Amino acid sequence: SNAMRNTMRSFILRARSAPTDSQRLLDEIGGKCHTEILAHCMMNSLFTAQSHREDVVIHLVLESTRDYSRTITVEANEISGFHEAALIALLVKALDASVGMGKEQTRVVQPGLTVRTISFEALLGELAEHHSLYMMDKKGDSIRDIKIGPNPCFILTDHNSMKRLGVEKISLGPKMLFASQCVTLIHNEIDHQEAGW
Amino acid sequence: TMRSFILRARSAPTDSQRLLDEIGGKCHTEILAHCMMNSLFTAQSHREDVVIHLVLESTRDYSRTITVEANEIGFHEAALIALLVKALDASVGMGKEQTRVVQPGLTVRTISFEALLGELAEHHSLYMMDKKGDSIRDIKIGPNPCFILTDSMKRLGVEKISLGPKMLFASQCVTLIHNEIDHQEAGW
């Protein structure tokens, strides 16, 4: 193996129960669709105590729709608080800007915030090229026992087409965890591997 | 075994209203809820045998300690924050060194941070976040551990640990602490 330099970390939250409708989104906070998890995932994936993390991208694929899913891409680099309402707000903003889009389309919302009518599977297609793709599997190999690829990208669900795309299964531990908790764990293991300890 | 956490929420108001006003405020009240959610809940269900003590310090008089016990007690910010508001409201009028039961597995106390440490030091293995501390991965977590989390110590016998190279939110530290005990106990 090579001595890696620090690379982009990406995450994909497949929120299949999540409304693409701006208002039905704020409605599901604490509701059966559990819309808080998106905000926590955003928090954990982009923020530490001191700073925001450099070079992180989260893709939120909001699926529950009358037409196309909205893929909301947040980039820690250009996104100039971390509580549930403020991050959920970033979403509503991007959702409002997506209304009336047709298929296979892209709309800049603000610096480092984009919305796209791209399928989950199509999006994987694009990331599959130059990213190391990973998914969660209680029966996958412990993450502490693999060498995490460069430009890694982690599929988290709010819950073989995959094997074709080179998607490798990993596990973070014995227990079932919130997607938001998976984020912190992933980040931490790459922080270790990068630091060498 | 038992797992415990203490969160010294210095500058977290003991008043109910001022707490709600701090959701995303100068003092970030949201992190109390997140600490609770991560210490008490997994995706499958609540955790067994977990206790969290929240020490709220921004007080007129005495600070309030809210102990939540996983065995006894929505997971979103407003639900767990509501638990706290109920607890602080149970605390109005309390004297120094008092205890008041809010509901099964919810308790409010007018005991100090160090006063609580002193008690816990009797039986718990005390631990502290320190970027210079041993890596949690290299030590064997002691029996009945308690993890101090910020927003004399050496005398009480608390020993320093680091979860990694970076500076995390208290709530992120809870996740990584649980996950390490989870590993050591399943023999991973």
Curated annotation (Swiss-Prot), chain A:
Principal subcellular localisation of the protein: cytoplasm
InterPro entries on file: Alpha/beta_knot_MTases, TrmY, tRNA_m1G_MTases_N
Enzyme Commission number, as recorded: 2.1.1.-
Alphabetized SUPFAM superfamilies for the sequence: alpha/beta knot (SSF75217)
Record bears the keyword S-adenosyl-L-methionine: yes
Keywords: Cytoplasm, Methyltransferase, S-adenosyl-L-methionine, Transferase
Binding site for S-adenosyl-L-methionine: 136, 182
GO cellular component terms attached to this protein's record: cytoplasm
Alphabetized GO MF terms: S-adenosylmethionine-dependent methyltransferase activity; tRNA methyltransferase activity
GO biological process per UniProt: tRNA methylation
Subcellular location: Cytoplasm
NCBIfam families in alphabetical order: PRK02135.1
Family to which this protein belongs: Belongs to the methyltransferase superfamily. TrmY family.
Protein name per Swiss-Prot or TrEMBL: Putative pseudouridine methyltransferase
Curated annotation (Swiss-Prot), chain B:
InterPro entries the UniProt entry points to: Alpha/beta_knot_MTases, TrmY, tRNA_m1G_MTases_N
Any GO molecular function: tRNA methyltransferase activity
Protein name: Putative pseudouridine methyltransferase
Organism: Vibrio cholerae serotype O1 (strain ATCC 39315 / El Tor Inaba N16961)
Keyword field: Cytoplasm, Methyltransferase, S-adenosyl-L-methionine, Transferase
GO terms under biological process: tRNA methylation
Gene3D superfamilies: 3.40.1280.10
Primary residence: cytoplasm
Enzyme Commission number(s): 2.1.1.-
Class of the enzyme per the UniProt entry, highest EC level: transferase
Family, per entry: Belongs to the methyltransferase superfamily. TrmY family.
Residues reported to bind S-adenosyl-L-methionine: 129, 173
Compartment list: Cytoplasm
The organism's place on the tree of life at top rank: Bacteria
GO cellular component terms given for this protein: cytoplasm
NCBIfam families named in the record: PRK02135.1
